[PDB]
RNA sequence: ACUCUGGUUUCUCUUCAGAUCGCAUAAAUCUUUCGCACUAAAGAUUUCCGUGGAGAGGAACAACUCUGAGUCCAAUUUUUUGAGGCCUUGCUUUGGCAAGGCUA
């Protein structure tokens, strides 16, 4: 064997990857879950930023630090499926619709 | 390599006895051992067939002589018997 | 696969060894071979009779050997 | 009460029909199977609880069987399979998929070598080595055989089906060597002494036969017929025991009352109610004379019967 | 090998190149006949009974071994 | 003092013995109260010149001083 | 239904290459130093405002032997972070402080 | 350090009087002059001749072929 | 884990079998000194008794390691 | 050894042109042997096969050996016997008596 | 080296989970503390977004990959020999046994 591949140095600067970058296996996360902004506002404050940037950055980091300090574990619980219970009653129907006619469909049902 | 010899591995350094062909019996404090039977011990309090007993206090005994060893009791709770 | 035996201890010693036939005799190590064939400097006799023999630089084939014994301190 | 236990306590929870109920032969635990596919370990004294369940028959438990060791629990069961369990903590030790029909009973070699002789609703009656992993000997029957057991010798498998005939087959000659006729239907249950030399006969004749299954022959071996059994539309598999003193054989019924005959009298011994529906098999425990009665009721009966 | 290893713990005599006997618990062996018999006692022609141990017997000097009682609990 | 009980130490967990030989480690229960930094553990009958062993010399001298109070004086 | 997923590890170069512009060029926790969950813990029990951290709300001493300023040597100025990075050392009453990561 | 066989080979260099032991055998020892080895140590002896302990009668033997596992010592003069 | 089949490491935080303290813990540094007594074999398979001390090593912590240095013979 | 070889047929140029092959003659001629083993017993027969251990099946001997009273010697037969062949001291072709 | 289990996917139902159950972070009620409470801290309770372990039922195709199980050494150092014969003493279970001295 060689003592060096193409794929050893991409695979060695993988092992320091940040968080999922350096794992090969997981679980999928729903959209609304990953933060993209949260590293940005975490790491420090860059230099020449004016006043109320500054104040921005350490309002969102209070609450971050609210919405840690004031985490709990969850209740146990029953297993919770709304639309299953619905799917069963013969009075809804289910079909594939596109993104924007449901869209309007549900706007003017709230009309 | 097999069992007992492993087992002879593990009785070094203590005060095993040993019998060869010739009748005699050296006890002492085993120093080393090998894969065969040359076991190097020191210390020896030695029994002859008609019953002299002697103080030889290095003995090198080559395996091919011997007829057996006799070990310490503690040795049943050692890792290869288990 | 025949390891020689660990004889560095005993090298250039005084020990007697004892052979078949009720056999002794004494003398200086100088050397073996991983078939514990032995090479003998100043080699005295010292047979059952109780009468000193010396005779030199003497070569014991393993197949004989009994005991070694240790005269001087190792 | 000549006994340990209580009197005629019950146990409740079998979810279905109890097709078979075994004591182990030290006498202190009890096996009990049916439609549940659900095998049931009770205890025997005590307050009688459920201690183990064994889970792992994708149909019904036919037949359910101990071998003198005790330790290993023989079941056949209706779908194609018999499992072989262990009764101390529980796990099937092996499964035996060889039959291709609905395997009606098992039988455990006691004496020698593990051997399971197995029948089924295909005509096969098929002898299972534990270590095989296979069939080894598979005894064609044209009918549907209902019970199969070995002989005290375990050389012997003696097989009774719907054929109208007791059949026992030998493990060396592999034929069939003689054929006890002299039942008028299905023949549902087979039992062996515990010294070997008699055999208990339950068949839809409404009739119990007692042979006599040895290599001594008298031309005619059905020396002991019993009568009060009765068969009935449920069509179920009326199975037998002895008592381990050889004294009294029970054959279950289909009237609801546990039968216990006596062996020398030839009268009914023990008519007892208290079941509701058809009484698949009944039991005897191995020092104590306690029976236990296996029924459609989904209730076993454990009793004082002296 | 599998006669010796249904041997195991087992309470087994053996018989010397020297008539001697050892009777001890068959703990370990290997393919030279070398055994570890533990609790060991020594039969001699006078008989006398003779506590060994942990014998280490060379192979070189056993001429046969035979089973006198089960393994102790 | 009276050995209440002796242990030989793994990291989270203790193995009790009745008897420790010489060259081990030991975990002594019941002689902490006449103990400050060190202590020799001798005979109470015999072993009359039983002198101790030195002191820890410590490879570097503390300068930092620090005092303390209590809040509440009573206690 | 899209639950579990594993990659190969050149698929996972060229999607740690593409998002190289949302990620930053850390590598080891010594940065966040006094910048972190734990300190900001501290500063919330202690009342005090770490330089670029958060503020929050609040959760009169005598002249004493043991407050006097003239045994007290003033060489160089105490401040917040010295409080925060060892809590038991210069605070008075520490009730709910959290102790924070040393090195890595 | 000497191993021994480079001391037969030292020997038959020297075609000294090499008087060998033997196995077993305390009183027959046999005088020679050595001239071969192999790996196994048999040993041929020019002018070979035996000598016992309580007899001691010197017979002549001639060049032998002495096997290796029959010898014990080998002893010059 | 060497000695213990049923002690293994986390797939992402270290194990620290040793560091059984709350300030150990939390500071992520070694404070006491930590005995440990082990059975290992060596090379040729012969089994041996490892009395093993995990000192601190940070600086202000020295004396830890005199306490340590005490009841030893290698470093 | 120098052949290392699988393919190893110098074990039967051994029972040819070697000294084994005196028993191979008892093999194809199916001559009597006579062998002395070493608790001093004479064992005359016909083997039938053997390998290089010397390890040798015979059938329908007749062995021998004396008892002292003062030495006599007795004879026993046996059918047919397995040999090892560390426990021999010489094997004999018996000679064309004629 | 020859055979017997165990599949994967999807849908539904029932239980347990203070495990970062969720590598993200909501809303309501009550008490207390101050302002004068969205610009505010703590405690308790509750509601929703939806998840991991176990069991049961259904049906779309692959059936032995994997997880298991049942199924070349004769020449020192051990397994291809230093082996067998003689004498004396104690007991002779009159076969010989134990010890010592021998020849090979």
Redesign the pocket.
Request: glycine letters at 8%; zero cysteines.
């Given at each position: 064997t060689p003592l060096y591949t193409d794929n050893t140095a991409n695979g060695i600067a993988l092992l320091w990857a940040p968080?999922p970058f350096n794992l090969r296996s997981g679980?999928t996360?729903?959209a609304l879950?990953?933060?993209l902004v949260?590293n940005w506002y975490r790491e420090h404050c860059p230099a020449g930023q004016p006043v109320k940037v500054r104040v921005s950055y350490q309002k969102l980091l209070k609450?971050?630090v609210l919405?840690?300090?004031?985490?709990?574990?969850?209740?146990?619980?029953?297993?919770?499926?709304?639309f299953?219970?619905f799917?069963?009653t013969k009075f809804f129907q289910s079909t594939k619709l596109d993104w924007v006619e449901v869209g309007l469909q549900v706007c003017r049902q709230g009309y | 390599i097999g069992v007992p010899?492993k087992v002879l591995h593990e009785a070094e350094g203590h005060i095993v006895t040993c019998e060869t062909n010739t009748?005699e019996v050296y006890r002492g404090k085993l120093i080393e051992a090998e894969?065969?039977?040359?076991c190097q011990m020191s210390n020896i309090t030695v029994t002859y067939?008609?019953g002299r007993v002697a103080q030889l206090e290095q003995v090198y005994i080559?395996?091919?002589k011997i007829r057996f060893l006799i070990l310490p009791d503690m040795l049943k709770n050692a890792p290869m018997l288990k | 696969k025949?390891h020689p035996?660990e004889l560095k201890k005993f090298m250039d010693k005084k020990l007697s060894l004892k052979l078949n036939?009720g056999r002794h005799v004494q003398g200086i190590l100088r050397g073996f071979?991983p078939?514990?064939?032995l090479v003998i400097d100043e080699c005295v006799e010292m047979a059952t009779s109780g009468q000193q023999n010396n005779i030199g630089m003497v070569v014991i084939?393993?197949?004989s050997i009994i005991m070694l014994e240790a005269l001087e301190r190792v | 009460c000549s006994s340990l236990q209580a009197p005629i306590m019950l146990l409740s929870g079998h979810e279905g029909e109890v097709y078979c109920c075994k004591f182990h032969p030290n006498g202190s635990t009890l096996a009990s199977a049916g439609f549940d596919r659900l095998i049931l370990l009770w205890n025997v004294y005590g307050d009688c609880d459920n201690y183990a369940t064994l889970?792992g028959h994708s149909g019904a438990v036919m037949e359910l069987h101990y071998n003198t060791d005790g330790s290993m629990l023989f079941s056949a069961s209706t779908d194609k399979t018999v499992a072989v369990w262990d009764s101390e903590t529980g796990e099937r030790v092996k499964?035996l998929?060889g039959h291709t029909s609905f395997v009606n009973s098992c039988y455990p070699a006691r004496r020698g070598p593990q051997l399971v002789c197995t029948g089924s609703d295909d005509g096969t009656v098929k002898l299972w080595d534990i270590?095989?992993?296979?069939a080894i000997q598979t005894f064609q029957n044209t009918y549907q055989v209902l019970a199969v057991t070995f002989n005290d010798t375990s050389d012997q498998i003696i097989s009774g089906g719907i054929d109208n005939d007791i059949k026992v087959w030998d493990l060396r000659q592999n034929k069939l060597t003689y054929t006890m006729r002299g039942h008028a239907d299905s023949v549902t249950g087979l039992s062996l002494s515990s010294e070997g030399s008699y055999l208990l006969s339950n068949a839809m004749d409404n009739t119990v036969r007692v042979w006599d299954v040895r290599p001594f022959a008298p031309k005619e071996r059905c020396v002991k017929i019993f009568q009060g059994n009765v068969h009935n539309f449920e069509k179920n598999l009326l199975r037998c025991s002895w008592s381990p003193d050889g004294s009294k054989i029970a054959a279950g019924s289909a009237d609801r009352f546990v039968y216990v005959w006596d062996t020398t009298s030839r009268r009914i011994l023990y008519k007892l109610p208290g079941h509701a529906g058809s009484i698949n098999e009944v039991a005897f425990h191995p020092d104590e004379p306690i029976i236990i009665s296996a029924s459609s009721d989904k209730r076993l009966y454990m009793g004082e019967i002296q | 090998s599998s006669k010796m290893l249904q041997h195991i713990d087992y309470r087994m005599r053996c018989i010397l190149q020297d008539?001697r006997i050892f009777i001890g618990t068959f703990k370990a062996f290997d393919k030279?006949?070398?055994l570890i018999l533990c609790d060991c006692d020594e039969f001699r022609?006078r008989e006398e009974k003779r506590v060994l141990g942990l014998v280490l017997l060379?192979?070189?000097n056993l001429v046969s071994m035979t089973v006198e009682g089960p393994p102790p609990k | 003092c009276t050995v209440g009980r002796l242990w030989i130490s793994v990291a989270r967990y203790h193995i009790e013995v009745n008897r420790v030989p010489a060259g081990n480690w030991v975990l002594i229960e019941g002689v902490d109260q006449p103990i400050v930094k060190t202590a020799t553990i001798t005979e109470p009958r015999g072993n009359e010149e039983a002198q101790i062993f030195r002191p820890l010399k410590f490879n570097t001298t503390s300068v930092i001083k620090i005092a303390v109070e209590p809040v509440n004086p009573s206690e | 239904?899209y639950?579990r997923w594993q990659f190969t590890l050149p698929m996972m170069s060229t999607l740690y290459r593409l998002a190289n512009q949302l990620l930053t060029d850390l590598v080891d926790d010594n940065y966040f130093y006094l910048f972190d969950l734990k300190a900001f813990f501290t500063s919330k029990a202690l009342n005090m405002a770490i330089p670029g951290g958060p503020k929050?709300?609040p959760?009169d001493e005598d002249w004493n032997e043991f407050n006097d300023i003239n045994k007290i040597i003033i060489r160089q100025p105490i401040r917040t972070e010295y409080k925060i990075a060892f809590p038991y050392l210069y605070n008075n009453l520490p009730h709910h402080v959290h102790l924070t990561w040393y090195h890595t | 350090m000497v191993q021994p066989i480079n001391l037969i080979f030292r020997y038959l260099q020297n075609r000294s009087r090499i008087q060998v032991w033997?196995?077993?055998?305390?009183?027959?020892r046999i005088e020679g002059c050595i001239i071969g080895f192999?790996e196994?140590?048999?040993l041929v002896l020019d002018d070979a001749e035996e000598i016992?302990?309580?007899t001691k009668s010197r017979k002549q033997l001639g060049r032998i072929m002495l096997k290796?596992?029959?010898i014990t010592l080998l002893q010059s003069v | 884990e060497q000695t213990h089949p049923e002690i293994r490491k986390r797939y992402?935080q270290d194990l620290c079998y040793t560091d059984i303290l709350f300030t150990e813990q939390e500071r992520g540094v070694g404070i006491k000194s930590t005995p440990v007594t082990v059975v290992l074999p060596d090379t040729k398979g012969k089994s041996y008794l490892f009395n093993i001390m995990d000192t601190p090593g940070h600086v202000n912590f020295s004396d830890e390691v005199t306490a340590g240095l005490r009841i030893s013979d290698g470093v | 050894?120098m052949t290392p070889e699988?393919l190893?047929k110098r074990e039967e140029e051994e029972f040819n042109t070697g000294p084994?092959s005196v028993l191979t003659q008892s093999v194809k001629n199916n001559t009597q042997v006579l062998i002395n083993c070493?608790?001093?017993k004479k064992l005359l027969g016909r083997v039938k096969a053997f390998d290089?251990?010397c390890?040798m099946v015979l059938e329908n001997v007749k062995e021998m050996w004396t008892e002292?009273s003062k030495p006599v010697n007795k004879d026993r037969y046996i059918s047919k016997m397995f040999l090892?062949?560390?426990?021999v001291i010489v094997v004999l072709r018996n000679p064309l008596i004629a």
């Open positions: 968080r679980r996360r729903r879950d990953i933060p949260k609450y971050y919405n840690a300090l004031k985490h709990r574990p969850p209740k146990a619980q029953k297993k919770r499926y709304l299953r219970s799917k069963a | 010899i009748g894969d065969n039977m040359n067939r008609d080559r395996g091919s | 025949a035996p036939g071979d078939f514990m064939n084939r393993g197949n | 889970k499964r998929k270590r095989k992993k296979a | 008539g030279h006949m070398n022609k060379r192979g070189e | - | 239904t639950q929050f709300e959760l | 033997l196995y077993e055998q305390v009183n027959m192999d196994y140590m048999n016992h302990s309580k290796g596992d029959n | 992402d | 050894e699988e190893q084994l070493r608790n001093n290089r251990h390890n002292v090892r062949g560390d426990s």
